[PDB]
Amino acid sequence: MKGTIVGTWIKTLRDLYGNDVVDESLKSVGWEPDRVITPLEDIDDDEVRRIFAKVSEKTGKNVNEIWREVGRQNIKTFSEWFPSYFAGRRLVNFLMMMDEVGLQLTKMIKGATPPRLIAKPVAKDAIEMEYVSKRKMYDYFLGLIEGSSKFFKEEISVEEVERGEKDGFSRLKVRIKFKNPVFEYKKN
Numbered sequence: 001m002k003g004t005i006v007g008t009w010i011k012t013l014r015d016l017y018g019n020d021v022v023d024e025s026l027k028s029v030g031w032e033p034d035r036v037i038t039p040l041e042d043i044d045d046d047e048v049r050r051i052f053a054k055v056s057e058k059t060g061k062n063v064n065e066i067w068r069e070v071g072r073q074n075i076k077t078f079s080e081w082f083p084s085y086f087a088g089r090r091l092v093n094f095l096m097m098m099d100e101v102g103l104q105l106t107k108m109i110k111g112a113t114p115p116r117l118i119a120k121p122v123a124k125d126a127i128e129m130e131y132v133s134k135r136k137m138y139d140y141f142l143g144l145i146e147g148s149s150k151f152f153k154e155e156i157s158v159e160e161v162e163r164g165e166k167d168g169f170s171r172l173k174v175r176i177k178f179k180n181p182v183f184e185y186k187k188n
């Protein structure tokens, strides 16, 4: 992972489980607890895995459970560090623009690999969004969706439709229903 995202994870882990659980976790992987991560730096995904695994051991929660909680809370963290992606927007627009944001990011940041989040309208009040990655972070993805709903204070229901791996790609498709109509039919 690029250092920007990893940095938000550390902060979010602290906010959720406290400095002690986090200090010992970073130490367990030979990191300095107060490590400063630079935005463009690359962090070994395996070291992250080991950190979250230690968090799991210390807190008693399973790793999946932790990733779901981090997903929910990290939206707040990210919104603090990068408000321009949230400013003046509403949930539906935020969710539908995110795939392009990732593709743009990939081009502007060497080595960055944000997952695909292709979204499409399926009803006047609903979209489908498919997470496609090399990384299988299913619970984090689901958590981020829930976190977005809280941040924007717009209630939604999320229904998982597909999950599975193929050709080394993890895929997870959800149907997200909004309270009010967000789409209308227009001539093509």
Ligand code: HEM
Binding pocket: 001, 002, 003, 004, 005, 078, 082, 085, 086, 098, 101, 102, 105, 111, 112, 113, 114, 115, 117, 133, 134, 135, 136, 137, 140, 141, 144, 145, 148
């Ligand atoms: C402010 C909006 C967002 C920005 C700027 C952003 C950007 C990024 C970046 C830079 C990464 C790191 C990729 C890497 O280090 O190689 C990442 C990872 C990720 N992004 Fe976002 N993202 C945003 C919102 C979202 C949302 C709303 C979702 C889901 C609904 C999402 C899903 C994910 C997931 C699940 C990962 C983990 C990597 C993986 O699973 O493959 N992101 N994103």
